[PDB]
Amino acid sequence: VGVGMENLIISTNEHASSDQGKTVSRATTNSKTDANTVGVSISAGYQNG
Amino acid sequence: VGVGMENLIISTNEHASSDQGKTVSRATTNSKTDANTVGVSISAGYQNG
């Protein structure tokens, strides 16, 4: 009795995945600011004096 | 009866994974602001008086 092989079949055990996603968002911002400025200027020249 | 070994084969049981991803997004912003300023200036000098 002998055994002969006629075909070899390979099944790869790899895992494949796919993902699909959607996002919607809304943001609201309120801002409040105050500023203070102090300035000093010195000028000197000759305009008819 | 004796047993002799001719080859040793090692199969490492480590898990390898790869991931590929793409993203597209769009944002829209609307802004509204109001500002108020009050200023006071004092000047003193000598220009023909």
UniProtKB/TrEMBL annotation, chains A, B:
It comes from the Bacteria. Coiled coil: none annotated. This is Iota toxin component Ib. It comes from Clostridium perfringens. The chain holds residues 299 to 347 of 875 of the full protein.
